[PDB]
């Protein structure tokens, strides 16, 4: 007997234009491809100023290259009261700022690379580095492990 509700996972970065949209889109497609239906994906940026903007060109290009849709995905601020079942931050500043913005957070908060065998702890911000391929590789290194963790933790059907 499985839990028959949805669970919500949010990826969170600074701008909600580079890292977390990329992760959101990859995760959504991966769940579709794995025939998993009870996980809903979101993203936020702790510091998004211009709200409602599409992802950075570099993220759109990587997603387009790999035929991953991002229709309707736009920048959204991590709100004073935002909370999700699972919150997956990109770097330490994101963790710190999430906890400062919402000290009442009830969901489980992780860094993306906790689900990865890569030695790195934090996903560098390609707003500066322009290394969108590296970010893509980091998300791929974590994605199925993250899915598996949530399916088991939330007692969901696969």
């Amino acid at each position: 007997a499985y839990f028959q509700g949805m669970v919500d996972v949010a990826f969170v970065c600074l701008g909600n234009i580079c890292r977390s949209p990329m992760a959101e889109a990859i995760m959504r497609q991966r769940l579709k491809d794995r025939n998993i239906h009870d996980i809903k994906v979101h993203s936020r940026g702790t510091g998004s100023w211009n709200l409602g903007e599409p992802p950075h060109e570099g993220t759109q290009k990587i997603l387009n290259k790999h035929n991953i849709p991002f229709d309707g995905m736009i920048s959204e601020l991590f709100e004073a009261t935002d909370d999700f079942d699972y919150i997956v931050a990109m770097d330490q500043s994101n963790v710190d700022n999430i906890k400062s913005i919402n000290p009442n957070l009830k969901g489980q908060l992780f860094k993306l690379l906790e689900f990865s065998n890569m030695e790195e702890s934090d996903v560098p911000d390609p707003y500066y580095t322009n290394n969108f391929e590296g970010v893509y590789d980091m998300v791929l290194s974590s994605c199925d492990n993250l899915i598996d963790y949530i399916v088991k933790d939330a007692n969901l059907k696969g």
């Binding site: 600074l14 701008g15 702790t46 510091g47 100023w49 500043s93 700022n97 999430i98 400062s100 913005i101």
Partner: peptide, 7 residues
């Protein structure tokens, strides 16, 4: 692109 919110 700054960490102002939350600091």
């Amino acid at each position: 692109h700054h960490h102002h919110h939350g600091s």
